[PDB]
């Protein structure tokens, strides 16, 4: 009532494309416990790296690393299907417990992070200034990650549907789609959003037949 223990900065993890995803917001009062279910980036992915982050930048690398740990033992599955529940729990003593749990296998790994870890009083004020200073740039980085992840979904989903479609797809549509996927995959290697979007545009324009078959099944 005259003081609050608060988090001066956001806490969370690295997600696909090197984004800091927040679990406990800035200026949250302790104690607190937030959880969020995530999944695998890759088919038949057997493990996840939980990279614990402090700060307000959208790029994971522009934030303070509080440590990392692995959860192993993820049974073969398509990407996006496993349920990995991540829990950030800060107690009365100011200690952060991060758990990751495979909701299928029951398996769990934690890291514990001293109240004293992370950025000191300067570096916080500094970190805040950079967040406000780089709101534009961080926003542009977010949009390229989102675009990359939309491009890769279109990529990976179109390949599946081609395999699922076999002889249904007129060879002439296959040729055009295969060339667009090769070109989209190439563009996703790069940093030019416009070009990713252009290969996505091209894929949609040659796939209209593939999409009918897929819907039908």
């Amino acid at each position: 009532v005259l003081l609050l223990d608060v988090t001066p900065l956001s806490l969370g993890i690295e997600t696909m494309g090197g984004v800091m995803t927040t679990l406990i917001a800035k200026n949250t009062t302790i104690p607190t416990k937030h959880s969020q279910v995530f999944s695998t980036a890759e088919d038949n992915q057997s493990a996840v790296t939980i990279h614990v982050l402090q700060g307000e930048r959208k790029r994971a690398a522009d934030n303070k690393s509080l440590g990392q740990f692995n959860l192993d033992g993820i049974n073969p599955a398509p990407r996006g299907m496993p349920q990995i529940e991540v829990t950030f729990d800060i107690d009365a003593d100011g200690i952060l417990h991060v758990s990751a749990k495979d909701k299928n296998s029951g398996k769990e790994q934690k890291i514990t992070i001293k109240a004293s870890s992370g950025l000191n009083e300067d570096e916080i004020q500094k970190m805040v200034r950079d967040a406000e200073a780089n709101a534009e740039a961080d926003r542009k980085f977010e949009e390229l990650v989102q675009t990359r992840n939309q491009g890769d979904h279109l990529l990976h989903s179109t390949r599946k549907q081609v395999e699922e479609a076999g002889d249904k797809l007129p060879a002439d549509d296959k040729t055009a789609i295969e060339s667009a996927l090769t070109a989209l995959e190439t563009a996703l290697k790069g940093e030019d959003k416009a070009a990713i979007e252009a290969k996505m545009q091209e894929l949609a324009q040659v796939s209209q037949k593939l999409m009918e078959i897929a819907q039908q099944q």
Binding site: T15, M16, F38, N70
Partner: peptide, 5 residues
């Protein structure tokens, strides 16, 4: 949302 290895 997805995590890499």
């Amino acid at each position: 949302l997805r995590i890499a290895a």
